Design an enzyme around this catalytic site. Structure first.
Site, PDB file in Angstrom:
ATOM      1  N   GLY A   1      -5.126   4.539  -2.599  1.00 23.93           N
ATOM      2  CA  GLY A   1      -4.251   4.273  -1.480  1.00 23.93           C
ATOM      3  C   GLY A   1      -4.503   5.110  -0.243  1.00 23.93           C
ATOM      4  N   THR A   2      -3.798   4.746   0.823  1.00 25.03           N
ATOM      5  CA  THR A   2      -3.866   5.423   2.109  1.00 25.03           C
ATOM      6  C   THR A   2      -3.476   6.881   1.929  1.00 25.03           C
ATOM      7  OG1 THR A   2      -3.564   3.710   3.806  1.00 25.03           O
ATOM      8  CG2 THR A   2      -2.332   5.768   4.083  1.00 25.03           C
ATOM      9  N   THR A   3      -3.917   7.735   2.844  1.00 23.17           N
ATOM     10  CA  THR A   3      -3.575   9.145   2.748  1.00 23.17           C
ATOM     11  C   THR A   3      -2.267   9.426   3.491  1.00 23.17           C
ATOM     12  OG1 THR A   3      -4.335  11.417   3.269  1.00 23.17           O
ATOM     13  CG2 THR A   3      -5.077   9.649   4.706  1.00 23.17           C
TER      14      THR A   3
END
Ligand SMILES: *C(=O)[C@]1([C@@H](O)[C@@H]2C=CCCC2)NC(=O)[C@H](CCF)[C@]1(C)O
Ligand SMILES: *C(=O)[C@]1([C@@H](O)[C@@H]2C=CCCC2)NC(=O)[C@H](CCF)[C@]1(C)O
Lengths: 204, 196, 244, 233, 244, 250, 243, 222
Positions: free
Chosen positions: C30-32
């Protein structure tokens, strides 16, 4: 209105020398209308006797219930239930209906098959136990019965004598009660045998 | 019943008579209407003895679990638990409760929870049948930030009057002092407070 | 034998719960997103990949508020994230309703923790596919937290998860050593904008949108709020500047 | 591999994937194409209705959820009915209880949450349908894309279904143009039909084959089918 | 999910047979043999005690013959613990009937009910069936002396003589060989012992390995009497019949 | 959530075996030896207190439990399973008997209750059978003294004497040689100690052995006086010291 | 067939692999702890390890204050540990409410052990991968240490140790008691008992400790509390001025 | 009914009369109002007889089970908490008014519980219609630091005040002493000041006096 005054009837139990007696009238009415002169209020499971006064439908129901319970008891215990034990069974069965009780006045009579000791007990409609040594009364003429018993009774009467006493207590109490009478039966109980006699009394 | 809680300079004091009646009969003359729900959060009970005991016992339970999970509860939080119980069950309860506790940041605090289950934070509060007779007296003699000695005197004089006129109040006067210093139990007998 | 990784609450021979570990993979993919605890509050920021010019800018908000003082951001399966916040909100409302006071961050964390841990006790459910960074200000300070799919969580000085968690942690660790006295809310915001720009290299292929929020006793009154307008652009630049 | 981890939605694969969800998504791709786009005054839905036989009808792909909201579907029709019905109730609840029209963004959140539950619990299955939601609320025109994974996104325009990538690139190109088509519905729709025709291949959009829906400023969500769409073919 | 560990105890085999019932019967075939023989003046129930020790207390033991009613009894072949569950509910159904109609329950009514309970575990609920087979010996005023049998499937039938448990094939052939409609209780008692004596998987047939019962209508009375022989009583009848 | 294991975990195999019951019995076999011997005026049950560490306080762990004042139990197999079984047995003795008849259940009936509980774990949905075998010793007015064994299947049988667990085979053989229907309680205790010695590897004293009896009424263990019909419990756990005294006469 | 290793049903050897694998999980944290009884106190020592510099050390603990009088240290993953702590706290609070007195350390231990036994018997519930050590100064029993495991087993101890190097700590303690001939640390102050505890921790593990390497809980009459970094430092110094 | 409790230097004593009534009629002249919850925790009960007995046995049963579960001696405060929460729940419909006393590991205790669930603590207490006659005696003779013997006397006198002055009380005095380090001693019929005088005549009837219609033997053996 009062459930314990619809059908009428009385029961009385007494202790004597190595014996116990339990008696009852045979009336079953509908208020002032006499309906049956053959409504016995004494039952027995093995050697334990149970008399029940009060609302007839409950007297019949309770008998059927205890026959049912003592039958299972015998099948598991492999012995007939004793007076002391049955009394506890009656008590807890009644309390189980604490807020919607059976309108009855039970009376237990019998001799413990192992100790030979005579035993009688009374209960209120919710199971409270009264374990008297002398006598126990129940029914629409219970006041009259207390009067009869407190005077006529004396300890260690022989079976034949207790018979005369229990009978005179029952009979004269019933004749002062509009809802009791129409016949009477007396049970004389001993370790080995039990005799049942029907009494002759007024039919009005 | 006559109960009150008063905040002062160093914290707060709870006070109460010790009478429980069943009609005109005094069932108990040495009753303790001051109940602990936490180390420094107590309450004054009025109304039904059975209801207030049951409420308190439950509050104490809730605050004990609260403490185990989130540390010491505020007095406001204790008053909220009492409130929840009293409001949500208003149809089946008869409880007039005063909640009083000592906080280090907030000092002393008093919350009164009357019959409906509403909550009221006040400098001081009086309740119970006996309280009706001392509304005037208390309103005239109360001052904020009083000293411990002054507050003990205010409560002793107020309750002695409540006890004097109210037949439902009597016995001894009990007090509980809540401050940073700890918890102190006080008791005053008839011979003393009757001749005030 | 094998097959210990097919059912959720099963212990493998070495005492592990493979399904939870696989959930972690969903998170790393996933996105940070990160969080930085400052001297009187906390800052949250996250990377929003711009799949195309069609995505309306500034619209698909990711950071979520719980009650009025808690901020939550997560990496992994977004829907799982929302699910967890919904629970958090009920958990918070229930706490306030009974105790009056808004829920303390530590207390709030265990509520989320117990709930997530619960999803590793049965095979009738799947573990949460997100790691969550959340926190706020309460009766005694600011608190930052990060919760893993296993239900595990701890208090943090700085925290990050997702694709570029390493870059972020590296950047965060720097700040920790160079600021033993504590960063300020204003500073933490900018610092956050940077850590995200930097950490964006592990995904430099796609363009993105920056999102920041904060809860500071002095800057927001202890209430969680989103960074918008000028203050936002200011941090964007501070980042665009130090990215070269 | 996959075969051992795709027997239900309560199982993560070794790489962190949820195959049942992915397979559900595959039902959308198999679905007929539909397009959605908006200006600052209107939002339009253009959907290609697919027919079974030449003796069959062209299944409806647009459902009105309220006077100010509606959507288009691609995939399992039944699931779209279940989801739109839920949306209709949520819109209704907002009106009856708060006398407030439901925010398009709020609807998206609700759908996401309803779908999410069907991906973390045993026994259920993910929804097998995609949805494009358009609406006009207190913040203007809105277009949303809903995926069974529970992911909902707000866009200026988009398309889902088979060959949807065609229309999508077109809109991602025409962006600056249509986004300014304010005060002129016919233009917005025409632009919608131009994006959709970019996904044709089989045939060409006919009269009983084209379906259009619009909502905006002073236009309650209404659906045009057949003769009513003739002036756009 | 849980489906993975579900044995599916209630399904058909491709041949239309119920796996669990079949396997339960297999289980029963290893149980001490029980025999039932109906005569003109009574019924005889005899069973072989499976496994015994010098220290086993036989006087207080009962593992095969149970009283259900004052007019009905059963011989058990299978899991004793399972049997007791069924025996208890059967004892209750009998009393419910008695309380309702003020008449002892007809033998078949009771057997059908118990068999229906068994059949249930066969069609729904996902539980294993009871590993039990019963031989019912009873008397009622509609059919007089009756002998029935029920097994895991819930099926039941009536017999003049029958056996359950181990070596029923052999035992049945022997019974079919020497049974005669005009038999008398004493004849039946002897036939039962002889039959067990020939099918026993043990050395000899001693009293400590047997349970014996009879339901007779004692001429000098007019009512029905069940007799569950005592160790010494079995030892006697064993010498008399010529088995010593 | 919600227990979705509503199907049996114990089922019949093609051979007619109920695997889980067999395996439970296997667990019992690995358990420490325990035994029981019936005398003419009492019953004794004993087992070894296999301390799992010298730092553990063996007293804080009773393998011999009082169920009713005239009934006690011991076991072999999984201690945790036994512990919960004891909690349940003590409770059913009340709910299903004392609260109904105002007297404690007779040994056979309570054994029957325990057995039922165990049978159910053999068929109810989502559970495994109990991995234990119990030996219950008790006394009741109309049945006198008795000793019973209850296995994982729920089956139970009365014994004159018997042993379960690790060296049951050997111990049973040794008991058959020394048992007769005229043993007095002290004789049985002595025989119990001798039988148990063969099964113990290390130290054999009143701190490593646990032993209890069902014998005469202990009016001294009642706690009150005033009711002639209440004479005291027949169940009594022997003290470490009482054991050692008898070990010297070994 | 091979599923007798996934849920809690017997294996042909009469074993429960899930309970065994749960025991394996207890060492996942690679932390060791030990508890000893003083004359009128109970002390529990536990290694504290904070690897990540981004962590707030103050929030990393495996000791819990279950009730005013009971403390619990957990050996195992933190989420299962917190699940166990919450349940124990609720159990302790309910017991007080229903029975009118504080739940005794051994009773709470039996209760948690019974719950554990359940996960061991019902298939839908998994065992918790933790070992719980409960301590207090019981009003009837005095200093007490009771520990429960994933098998539902529990017992009282004179002293005990848990973790990867459990055996070394145990033999060390065993030796000390074979020598002293008494079942407790004959010290009047808990501070000295804490010092004893840490001293033997060091000897057994052959390692030195700073104030942030340990975690300490102490139980006295009517109160259980944990020590601070500084309270501990004062402890470490004292032991230093002896070696 | 008259029931009382009185604490003394090393324990606590409770007493009760033995009259049971149905309206103005004495249904039982020697009932027992003293109930045992556990060996050293006894209860004196007033109000609805079936209720005092039933509630006492229920909690006694649960207390025994709790004792076994915790391997500890039952505490009076436990019986008190269980009784009050049970009585509170039933909003006074279970007409049990009790004086619960006993000794346990924490000392000796004396409490009272009313049907609605409220509890009280004191050195001396009494409930029932005879409550006032008893309390008058207690308020007149009680003092702190009473000996076991003085306590038994006070309690016993308090009950007599009821037997004699309350129509709801009569017959005998039952007592139970619970001392800190000894077994509890139950003294059934400690006092029996109401023995009926010999009757003036014997009413034994001559055999044959009663008319009998039919006679038969009853079968008991199955
Ligand atoms: C005071 O409110 C009363 C007290 O008896 C109770 C008892 C204990 C603490 C709570 C308060 N409550 C009453 O009902 C009673 C009579 C009121 F008319 C009381 C004395 O005032
Ligand atoms: C005393 O409280 C009364 C007793 O009859 C019962 C009987 C046995 C023990 C419990 C108490 N209860 C009554 O209701 C009755 C009359 C009340 F006016 C009683 C004699 O006082």
């Amino acid at each position: 209105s009062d459930p314990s005054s619809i059908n009428g009837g009385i029961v009385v139990a007494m202790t004597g020398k190595d014996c116990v007696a339990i008696a009852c009238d045979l009336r079953l009415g509908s208020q002032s209308l006499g309906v049956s002169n053959k409504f016995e209020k004494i039952f027995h499971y093995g050697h334990v006797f149970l008399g029940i006064t009060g609302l007839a439908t409950d007297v019949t129901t309770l008998n059927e219930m205890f026959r049912y319970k003592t039958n299972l008891y015998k099948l598991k215990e492999e012995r007939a239930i004793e007076p002391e034990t049955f009394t506890q069974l009656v008590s807890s069965s009644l309390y189980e209906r604490r807020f919607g009780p059976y309108f009855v006045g039970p009376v237990v009579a019998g001799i413990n098959s192992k100790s030979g000791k005579p035993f009688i007990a009374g209960f209120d409609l919710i199971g409270c136990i009264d374990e008297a040594k002398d006598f126990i009364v129940s029914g629409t003429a219970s006041d009259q019965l207390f009067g009869m018993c407190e005077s006529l009774y004396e300890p260690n009467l022989e079976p034949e004598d207790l018979f005369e006493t229990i009978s005179q207590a029952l009979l004269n109490a019933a004749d002062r009660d509009a809802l009791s009478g129409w016949g009477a039966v007396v049970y004389i109980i001993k370790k080995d045998e039990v005799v049942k006699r029907y009494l002759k009394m007024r039919q009005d | 019943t006559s109960i009150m809680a008063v905040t002062f300079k160093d914290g707060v004091i709870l006070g109460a008579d010790s009478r429980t009646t069943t009609g005109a009969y005094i069932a108990n003359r040495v009753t303790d209407k001051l109940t602990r729900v936490h180390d420094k959060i107590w309450c004054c009970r009025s109304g039904s003895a059975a209801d207030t005991q049951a409420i308190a016992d439950i509050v104490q339970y809730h605050l004990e679990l609260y403490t185990s999970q989130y540390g010491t509860p505020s007095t406001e939080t204790a008053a909220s638990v009492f409130k929840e119980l009293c409001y949500e069950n208003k149809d089946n309860l008869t409880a007039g409760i005063i909640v009083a506790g000592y906080d280090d940041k907030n000092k002393g605090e008093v919350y009164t929870i009357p019959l409906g289950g509403s909550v009221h934070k006040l400098p001081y509060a009086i309740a119970g049948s006996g309280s009706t007779f001392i509304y005037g007296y208390c309103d005239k003699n109360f001052r904020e930030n009083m000293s411990k000695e002054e507050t003990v005197d205010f409560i002793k004089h107020s309750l002695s009057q409540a006890i004097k006129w109210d037949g439902s109040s009597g016995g001894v006067i009990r007090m509980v002092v809540l401050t940073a210093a700890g918890v102190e139990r006080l008791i005053f007998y008839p011979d003393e407070y009757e001749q005030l | 034998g094998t097959g210990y990784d097919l059912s959720n609450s099963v212990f493998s021979p070495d005492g592990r719960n493979f399904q939870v570990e696989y959930a972690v993979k969903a998170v790393e993919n996933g996105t940070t997103s990160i969080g930085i605890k400052c001297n009187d509050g906390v800052v949250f920021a996250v990377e929003k990949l711009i799949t195309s010019k069609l995505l309306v800018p500034q619209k698909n908000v990711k950071i979520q508020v719980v009650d009025r003082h808690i901020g939550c951001v997560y990496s992994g399966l977004i829907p799982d994230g929302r699910h967890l916040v919904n629970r958090g909100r009920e958990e918070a409302a229930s706490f306030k309703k009974l105790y009056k006071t808004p829920i303390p961050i530590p207390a709030f964390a265990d509520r989320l923790g117990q709930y997530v841990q619960a999803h590793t006790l049965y095979n009738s459910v799947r573990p949460f596919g997100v790691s969550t960074i959340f926190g706020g200000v309460d009766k005694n300070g600011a608190h930052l937290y990060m919760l893993e799919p296993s239900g595990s969580y701890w208090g943090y000085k700085g925290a990050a998860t997702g694709k570029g968690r390493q870059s972020a942690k590296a950047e965060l660790e720097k700040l920790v050593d160079h600021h033993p006295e504590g960063l300020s809310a204003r500073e933490a915001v900018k610092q956050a904008a940077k850590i995200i720009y930097l950490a964006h290299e592990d995904n430099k292929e796609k363009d993105f949108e920056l999102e920041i929020s904060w809860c500071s006793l002095s800057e927001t009154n202890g209430l969680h709020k989103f960074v918008k307008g000028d203050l936002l652009q200011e941090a964007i630049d501070f980042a665009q500047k130090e990215i070269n | 591999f996959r075969n051992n981890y795709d027997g239900d939605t309560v199982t993560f694969s070794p790489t962190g994937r949820l195959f049942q969800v992915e397979y559900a998504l595959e039902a959308i791709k198999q679905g007929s194409v539909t397009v959605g786009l908006r200006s600052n005054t209107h939002a339009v839905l253009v959907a290609l209705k697919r027919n079974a036989d030449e003796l069959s009808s062209y299944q409806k792909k647009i459902i009105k959820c309220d006077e100010h909201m509606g959507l288009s579907l691609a995939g399992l029709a039944p699931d779209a009915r279940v989801l739109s019905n839920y949306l209709r109730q949520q819109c209704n609840y907002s009106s009856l209880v708060f006398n407030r029209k439901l925010a398009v963004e709020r609807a998206g959140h609700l759908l996401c949450d309803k779908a999410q539950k069907n991906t973390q619990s045993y026994g259920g299955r993910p929804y097998g349908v995609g949805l494009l939601i358009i609406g006009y609320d207190k913040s203007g025109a809105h277009l949303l894309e809903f995926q069974p994974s529970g992911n909902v996104t707000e866009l200026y325009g988009t398309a889902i279904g088979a060959r949807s990538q065609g229309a999508k690139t077109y809109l991602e190109r025409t962006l600056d143009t249509f986004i300014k088509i304010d005060g002129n519905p016919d233009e917005l729709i025409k632009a919608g039909v131009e994006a959709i025709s970019q996904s044709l291949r089989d045939e060409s959009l006919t009269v009983d084959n084209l379906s259009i829906a619009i909502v905006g400023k002073d236009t309650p969500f209404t659906i045009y089918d057949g003769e009513a769409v003739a002036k756009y073919i | 999910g849980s489906r993975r560990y579900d044995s599916r105890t209630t399904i058909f085999s491709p041949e239309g047979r119920l796996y669990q019932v079949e396997y339960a019967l297999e289980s029963i075939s290893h149980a001490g043999t029980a025999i039932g023989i109906m005569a003109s003046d009574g019924i005889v129930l005899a069973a072989e005690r499976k496994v015994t020790s010098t220290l086993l207390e036989q006087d207080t033991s009962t593992e095969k013959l149970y009283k259900l009613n004052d007019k009905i009894a059963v011989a058990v072949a299978g899991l004793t613990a399972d049997a007791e569950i069924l025996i208890n509910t059967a004892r209750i159904h009998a009393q419910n009937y008695l309380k309702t109609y003020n008449e002892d329950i007809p033998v078949e009514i009771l057997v059908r009910r118990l068999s229906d309970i068994k059949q249930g575990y066969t069609q729904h609920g996902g539980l294993r069936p009871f590993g039990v087979s019963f031989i019912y010996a009873g008397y009622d005023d509609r059919y007089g002396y009756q002998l029935y049998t029920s097994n895991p499937s819930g099926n039941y039938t009536g017999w003049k003589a029958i056996s359950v448990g181990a070596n029923t094939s052999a035992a049945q052939t022997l019974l079919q060989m020497d049974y005669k409609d005009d038999m008398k209780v004493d004849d039946a008692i002897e036939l039962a012992l002889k039959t067990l004596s020939k099918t026993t998987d043990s050395s000899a047939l001693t009293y400590d390995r047997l349970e014996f019962a009879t339901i007779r209508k004692g001429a000098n009375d007019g009512e029905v009497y069940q007799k569950i022989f005592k160790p010494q009583e079995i030892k006697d009848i064993l010498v008399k019949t010529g088995i010593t | 959530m919600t227990d979705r294991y509503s199907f049996s975990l114990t089922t019949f195999s093609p051979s007619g075996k109920l695997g889980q019951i067999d395996y439970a019995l296997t667990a019992v076999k690995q358990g420490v030896t325990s035994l029981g011997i019936k005398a003419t005026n009492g019953v004794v049950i004993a087992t070894e207190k296999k301390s799992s560490s010298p730092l553990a306080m063996s007293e804080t762990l009773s393998k011999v439990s009082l169920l009713t004042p005239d009934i006690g139990a011991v076991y072999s197999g999984m201690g945790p399973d036994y512990r919960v079984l004891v909690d349940k047995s003590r409770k059913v003795a009340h709910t299903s008997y004392k609260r109904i008849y105002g007297e404690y259940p007779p040994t056979k009936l309570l054994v029957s209750e325990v057995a039922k509980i165990m049978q159910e774990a053999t068929q109810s949905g989502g559970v495994r059978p109990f991995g234990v075998s119990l030996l219950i010793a008790g006394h009741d007015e109309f049945n006198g003294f008795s000793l019973y064994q209850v296995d994982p299947s729920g089956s139970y049988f009365p014994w004159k004497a018997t042993a379960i667990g690790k060296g049951s085979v050997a111990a049973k053989t040794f008991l058959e040689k020394r048992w007769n229907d005229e043993l007095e309680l002290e004789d049985a205790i002595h025989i119990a100690l001798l039988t148990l010695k063969e099964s113990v590897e290390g130290e054999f004293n009143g701190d490593t052995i646990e032993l209890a009896i069902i014998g005469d009424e202990n009016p001294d263990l009642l706690g009150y006086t005033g009711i002639p019909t209440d004479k005291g419990p027949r169940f009594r756990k022997l003290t470490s010291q009482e054991i050692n005294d008898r070990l010297e006469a070994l | 067939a091979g599923y007798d290793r996934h849920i809690t049903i017997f294996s042909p050897e009469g074993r429960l692999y899930q309970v065994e694998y749960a025991f394996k999980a207890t060492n996942q944290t690679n932390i060791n702890s030990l508890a000893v009884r003083g004359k009128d106190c109970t002390v529990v020592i536990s290694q504290k390890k904070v690897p990540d510099k981004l962590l707030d050390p103050t929030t990393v603990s495996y000791i819990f204050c279950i009730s005013r009088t009971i403390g619990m240290v957990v050996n195992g993953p933190i989420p299962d540990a917190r699940n166990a702590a919450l349940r124990a706290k609720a159990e302790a609070a309910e017991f007080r409410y229903k029975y009118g007195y504080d739940m005794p350390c051994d009773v709470l231990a039996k209760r948690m052990a019974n719950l554990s036994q359940i996960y061991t018997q019902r298939a839908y519930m998994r065992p918790l991968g933790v070992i719980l050590t409960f301590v207090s100064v019981d009003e009837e029993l005095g200093p007490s240490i009771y520990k429960t495991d994933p098998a539902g087993y529990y017992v009282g101890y004179k002293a005990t140790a848990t973790g990867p190097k459990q055996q070394e700590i145990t033999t060390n303690l065993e030796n000390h008691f074979k020598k002293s001939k008494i079942d407790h640390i004959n010290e009047e102050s808990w501070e000295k008992v804490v010092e004893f505890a840490i001293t033997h921790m060091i000897d057994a593990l052959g390692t030195e400790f700073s104030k942030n390497d340990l975690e300490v809980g102490v139980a006295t009459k009517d109160k259980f509390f944990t020590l601070s970094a500084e309270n501990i430092e004062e402890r470490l110094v004292a032991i230093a001025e002896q070696d | 009914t008259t029931i009382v409790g009185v604490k003394f230097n090393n324990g606590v004593v409770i007493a009760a009369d033995t009259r049971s009534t149905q309206g103005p009629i004495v249904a039982d002249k020697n009932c027992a109002k003293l109930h045992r919850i556990s060996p050293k925790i006894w209860c004196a009960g007033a109000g609805t007889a079936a209720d005092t007995e039933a509630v006492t046995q229920l909690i006694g049963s649960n207390i025994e089970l709790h004792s076994l579960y915790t391997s500890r001696e039952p505490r009076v405060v436990s019986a008190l908490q269980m009784l009050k929460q049970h009585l509170f729940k039933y909003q006074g419909h279970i007409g049990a008014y009790l004086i619960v006393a006993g000794v346990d590991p924490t000392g000796s205790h004396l409490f009272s519980i009313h049907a609605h669930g409220s509890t009280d603590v004191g050195y001396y207490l009494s409930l029932g219609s005879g409550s006032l006659a008893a309390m008058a005696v207690l308020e007149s003779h009680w003092k702190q630091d009473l000996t076991k013997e003085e306590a038994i006397k006070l309690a016993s006198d308090a009950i007599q005040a009821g037997i004699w002055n309350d129509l709801g009380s009569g017959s005998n005095v039952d007592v139970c002493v619970m001392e800190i380090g000894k077994d509890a001693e139950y003294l059934r019929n400690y006092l029996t000041p109401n023995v009926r005088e010999e009757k003036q005549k014997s009413y034994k009837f001559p055999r044959g006096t009663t008319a009998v219609l039919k006679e038969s033997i009853v079968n008991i053996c199955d």
